[PDB]
Every structure is written in structure tokens, then in C-alpha cells.
């Protein structure tokens, strides 16, 4: 690794920049990255390969989330000011009027 190992520290609190860690991009990353990252995660574990994986399943679920809150610029700005809420995470708005 690198010469200069640092001590480990954990903060038992609501995920602040977790969605940024899952992928591997900084809190100030750029679309190009946020995207290139999410893509990488997929390639690693595909829905076809993992026939019956447990660890992959869970992680996969979380990963996607990262490509949701940050996936869209607007959102990113919302969470920044603390405007983001569950309603957004779950997004009840479903059913594109048609017919």
C-alpha cells in the first residue's frame, strides 16, 4: 500500500457522504466520474453472473442508490442544502401518463 498508515475512526451517524464512498468519488467529484464509477460497480457484479450471491445482492442494492441521489445534478444540490428526503429516495411518483 502506502507508507504512512493512518488510524481508523468511525462516526455512528446518518450517512453523510456514503453514496460518494460506495463508488469512490469525492464529495466534489464530476459527472464524468460519478458515472464512470457507477458503471465499474456493475461490470464487477452483473445480474446474470451472480446466480445466487448473497453479499453481492445486498451491496448491489446499496450501490444503485449512489447512482440515484447523485445520478442527477439537481438532487445532489438538494441533499447539499438538506432538501433531499425519503420521498425522493423511494420516489412514489410512478406512472407516466399515456393513453
Give the integer Cα–Cα distance in Å for 38 and 67.
Answer: 6
Q: How far is CA 26 from the centre of its chain?
A: 12
Q: Is residue 57 part of a domain?
A: yes
Q: Is residue 1 part of a domain?
A: no
Q: Is residue 44 part of a domain?
A: yes
Q: Is residue 46 part of a domain?
A: yes
Residue 71 CB neighbour total at 10 angstroms:
16
Q: Is residue 99 part of a domain?
A: no
Q: How far is CA 33 from the centre of its chain?
A: 12
Give me the half-sphere count of Cα atoms (radius 13 Å) on the Cβ side of residue 85: 3
Closest Cα partner for 80 from 22, 13, 20? 20
Determine the straight-line distance between the first and last CA of the chain, rounded to whole angstroms: 59
Output the domain CATH number for residue 58.
1.10.287.110
Q: Is residue 41 part of a domain?
A: yes
Radius of gyration of the chain (CA): 16
Q: The domain containing residue 23 runs over which residues?
A: 17-91
- Domain count along the chain: 1
Amino acid at each position: 500500500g502506502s507508507s504512512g498508515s493512518s488510524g481508523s475512526q468511525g462516526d455512528c451517524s446518518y450517512s453523510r457522504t456514503a453514496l460518494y464512498d460506495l463508488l469512490g468519488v469525492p464529495s466534489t467529484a464530476t459527472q464524468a466520474q460519478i458515472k464512470a464509477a457507477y458503471y465499474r460497480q456493475c461490470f464487477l457484479y452483473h445480474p446474470d453472473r451472480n446466480s445466487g450471491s448473497a453479499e453481492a445482492a445486498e451491496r448491489f442494492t446499496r450501490i444503485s442508490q449512489a447512482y440515484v441521489v447523485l445520478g442527477s445534478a439537481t438532487l445532489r444540490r438538494k441533499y447539499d442544502r438538506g432538501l433531499l428526503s425519503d420521498e425522493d429516495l423511494r420516489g412514489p411518483g410512478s406512472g407516466p401518463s399515456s393513453g
